[PDB]
From a paper:
We set out to design proteins that can switch between two well-defined and fully structured conformations. We reasoned that these goals could be collectively achieved with a “hinge”-like design in which two rigid domains move relative to each other while remaining individually folded. The hinge amplifies small local structural and chemical changes to achieve large global changes while the chemical environment for most residues remains similar throughout the conformational change, avoiding the need for global unfolding. Designing one of the resulting conformations to bind to a target effector couples the conformational equilibrium with target binding.
We solved crystal structures for two designs, cs207 and cs074. For design cs074, the crystal structure of the hinge-peptide complex agrees well with the corresponding state Y design model. For example, cs074 (site pair 1) showed a clear peak between 40 and 50 Å in absence of the peptide, and a peak between 30 and 40 Å in presence of the peptide, and both peaks agree well with the corresponding simulations (top row). In a control experiment using the static parent DHR protein of design cs074, the distance distributions with and without peptide were identical and matched both the simulation for the parent design model, which closely resembles state X, and the experimental distance distribution for state X of cs074. To increase both the absolute distance from N- to C- terminus and the change in termini distance between the two conformational states, we took advantage of the extensibility of repeat proteins and extended hinges cs074, cs221, and cs201 by 1-2 helices on their N and C termini, yielding cs074F, cs221F, and cs201F, respectively (first column). For hinges cs074F and cs221F the distance between the label sites is above the R0 of the dye pair in state X and below R0 in state Y, and hence, acceptor emission upon donor excitation increases upon addition of the corresponding peptides cs074B and cs221B, respectively (second column). FP based titrations and kinetic characterization using the unlabeled extended hinge cs074F in excess over the TAMRA-labeled peptide cs074B agree well with the corresponding FRET experiments, further supporting the pre-equilibrium model.
Residue numbers in the entry:
A (entry chain A): 2 to 230
B (entry chain B): 239 to 261
The structure:
């Protein structure tokens, strides 16, 4: 019953995000792709709430697979529009659409007891982690070259989802050194962004720059816990 | 469940797109 309502509510948001992509393809607003992304993310939270308390529900497993395909459609167009504009911001949104696609495929593969694809989803999360790190390395250059405080926040957000990516692969297999090394690589990159945030904060004050400079070091602690363990 | 091979291409597609931003 409750699982049925969560699956239905998840399908309501997927078809709604499906029409936003078709509208976004017609020379659409990147916000239309973000609105489709936000709708799909909440839909993934619905099937997660549905797979929990009732796994192996083929309707919930099928719905989780349909979300992963629709999440890649947002990621597909976000990569294309990021290659035209050259904006690393769209590369961040594209990496988020893949991240939730990794979760959606990891939920269904683990629920259907498909160790074949469940371990494959964990390996792709490690590959996505090194992408979000390079995306963060790119947002650090444009935040220094073009001088934008927003780009340093997005650089941290790129590393925060990169830590969540290796957190998914470590939970499945803690003895994966490529995910362990990447966690060590993300930890040191988080301290670089934290030094960038604190320096610019000392020059301009501002509570946000100080708060995110503290959050960057605290995310580096979680990634350091993932690395040493 | 073939999305497992489809997603690893998406993370690899973003690799080449990210690396293509140099030009």
């Amino acid at each position: 019953e409750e699982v049925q309502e969560a699956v239905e509510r998840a399908e309501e948001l997927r078809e709604e995000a499906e029409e936003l992509i078709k509208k976004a393809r017609k020379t659409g607003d990147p916000e239309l792709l973000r609105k489709a992304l936000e709708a799909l993310k909440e839909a993934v939270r619905a099937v997660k709430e549905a797979i929990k308390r009732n796994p192996d529900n083929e309707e919930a497993v099928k719905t989780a697979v349909r979300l992963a395909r629709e999440l890649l459609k947002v990621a597909e167009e976000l990569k294309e529009r990021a290659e035209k504009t050259g904006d690393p911001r769209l590369l961040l949104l594209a990496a988020e659409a893949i991240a939730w696609a990794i979760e959606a495929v990891f939920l269904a593969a683990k629920a259907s007891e498909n160790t074949e694809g469940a371990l494959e989803a964990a390996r792709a999360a490690v590959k996505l982690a090194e992408v979000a790190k390079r995306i963060a390395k790119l947002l650090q250059r444009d935040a220094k070259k073009e001088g934008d405080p927003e780009l340093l926040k997005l650089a941290l957000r790129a590393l925060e989802l990169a830590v969540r990516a290796v957190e998914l692969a470590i939970k499945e297999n803690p003895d994966n050194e490529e995910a362990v090394e990447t966690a060590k690589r993300l930890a040191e990159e988080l301290r670089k962004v934290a030094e960038l945030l604190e320096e610019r904060a000392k020059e301009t004050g501002d509570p946000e720059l100080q708060e995110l400079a503290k959050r960057a070091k605290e995310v580096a602690d979680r990634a350091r816990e993932l690395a040493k363990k």
